[PDB]
Amino acid sequence: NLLKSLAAGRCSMTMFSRVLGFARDAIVARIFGAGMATDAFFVAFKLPNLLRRIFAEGAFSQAFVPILAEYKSKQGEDATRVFVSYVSGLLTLALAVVTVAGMLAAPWVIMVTAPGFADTADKFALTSQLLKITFPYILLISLASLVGAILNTWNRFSIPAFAPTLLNISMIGFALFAAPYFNPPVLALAWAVTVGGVLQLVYQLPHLKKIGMLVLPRINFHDAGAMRVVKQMGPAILGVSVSQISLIINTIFASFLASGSVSWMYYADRLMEFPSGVLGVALGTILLPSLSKSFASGNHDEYNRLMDWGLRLCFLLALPSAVALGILSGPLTVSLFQYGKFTAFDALMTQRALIAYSVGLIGLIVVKVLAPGFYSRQDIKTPVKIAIVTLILTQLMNLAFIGPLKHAGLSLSIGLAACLNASLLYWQLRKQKIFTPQPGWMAFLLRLVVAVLVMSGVLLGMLHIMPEWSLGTMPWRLLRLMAVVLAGIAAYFAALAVLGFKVKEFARRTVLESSGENLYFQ
Ligand SMILES: CCCCCCCC/C=C/CCCCCCCC(=O)OC[C@H](O)CO
Ligand SMILES: CCCCCCCC/C=C/CCCCCCCC(=O)OC[C@H](O)CO
Ligand SMILES: CCCCCCCC/C=C/CCCCCCCC(=O)OC[C@H](O)CO
Ligand SMILES: CCCCCCCC/C=C\CCCCCCCC(=O)OC[C@H](O)CO
């Protein structure tokens, strides 16, 4: 069963990792708030935060491991050290020159990414400085992602799954203990990121030495295998990470809005990163390997059947989560962030961006299902072309929404674009005659919609009997939040079982048995 790969140890490590990342953002919100200095940091954190997410969500492993597994097995450990050396060298060289260039041209990078910060000479100079300190992370996090994939190919798993923790450990310790000794104190966060990057790599190196895969990076532009790996890294991200690239571009527009517009968008996107990340990783861990296996063997039925099951798991979990985040946007922002320098105005500005983001949770998760359907057949070009159309239309919605809705309209542009990205991938899988659904989708969706209203009704009613969400310290707020969340989860799954949906049966679908057997026992 393909579902035995989710509860394979790291299930308690997804928990520890998500909790500790929450703990970082809560601590950052307390000590630094959502203003000038966090604005500057969150701009300089944009590209690092994008790469961290790839390594924490195991995305590069999902891509590199099949390449390295194929070419360890057919043609050798001795040749695989060489391949890794050539892959490692290209990554290092390419990213070393980018990092150095970006550090010496840091003010000009901010002129492109946050031009509205040029009205504020002191805010601009700080952003440039923070970006200079955090560039080396881009190299550091990329080598760590490669190292983690080598370990994962050799079936270690636990050491690379833990390394993402180290960044949040670094930033928490710096924010709590080192920040007073810096001026301005946000400089501690920047150094914490680069130190976190050093730790995320150095943590994994000794275990690589044990498997004989610690090789000194070298350059050889004639290795076509090394060139395709690095060259198709970007296009592969772009086809599955348009929302995250749109945050970076929206920063241009947000640089002209009120103080904290960048921060309010950051905190709202982290809150949504929880259902996005957890569900996206789980769906990816199950889909891409098995779908690639079926495509390799011509198993058209099991390709099509796992496709349909995953897209039903998608709507089953994303739709209630999306509505729940919207309904609970206020309670979530007050209970998790409204402490210290993060005020109730900050909480409302974060809530409004979250409600906008909420519209696109379902699209983000459908993309995590539909893009693999192309990637399994070695078609990057179709998701990439869709990605480019989506980026262009996101920026057009910015021009339409920034007026009335400010930073929330820039958030909504990302939300509606994920729904667009997903529907363009479905239309392409149907026109190209690759996926055709199983029967009963309309009945399946209608029971979900009814169960979601039931959940919403219980959610809204629970919010009415509860006090103001700022009442009490953090334990009391969180305890009340868990009472409202448990009531929603219970109502949602209670309504599905009344309407006749078997969650337990859904997890024992026959396609899951044979897909797991066909993939694990290759
Ligand atoms: C609201 C506005 C919506 C606008 C929507 C715009 C259209 C989006 C479609 C993209 C075409 C994708 C086609 C991808 C390539 C198909 C051709 C093909 O199969 O080429 C493979 C090639 O041979 C490999 O080398
Ligand atoms: C890659 C190169 C990027 C750089 C090159 C392109 C730069 C485009 C900047 C546009 C400003 C957008 C923000 C507009 C500032 C005013 C804020 C606003 O829209 O407020 C609404 C209205 O003024 C009251 O309701
Ligand atoms: C399944 C659907 C039903 C679910 C049923 C869940 C039961 C537990 C709920 C507790 C509500 C708590 C109410 C108020 C909690 C805060 C108490 C407080 O101090 O509020 C201020 C006070 O009214 C003046 O001082
Ligand atoms: C606010 C919510 C916005 C949501 C936006 C999400 C867009 C995702 C795009 C496509 C997914 C379609 C899902 C699958 C629908 C298949 C329907 C169909 O054709 O059913 C055939 C039937 O089962 C007989 O074979």
UniProtKB/Swiss-Prot annotation:
The keyword Transmembrane helix applies. Pfam families: MurJ. Keywords: Cell inner membrane, Cell membrane, Cell shape, Cell wall biogenesis/degradation, Membrane, Peptidoglycan synthesis, Transmembrane, Transmembrane helix, Transport. Pathway: Cell wall biogenesis; peptidoglycan biosynthesis. Residues 33-40, 110-123, 179-185, 254-263, 338-346, 403-409, 464-477 are periplasmic. One of its GO terms (biological process) is regulation of cell shape. Belongs to the MurJ/MviN family. FtsW (AC P0ABG4) is also proposed to act as a lipid II flippase. The identity of the lipid II flippase is controversial with conflicting in vivo and in vitro results. This is Lipid II flippase MurJ.
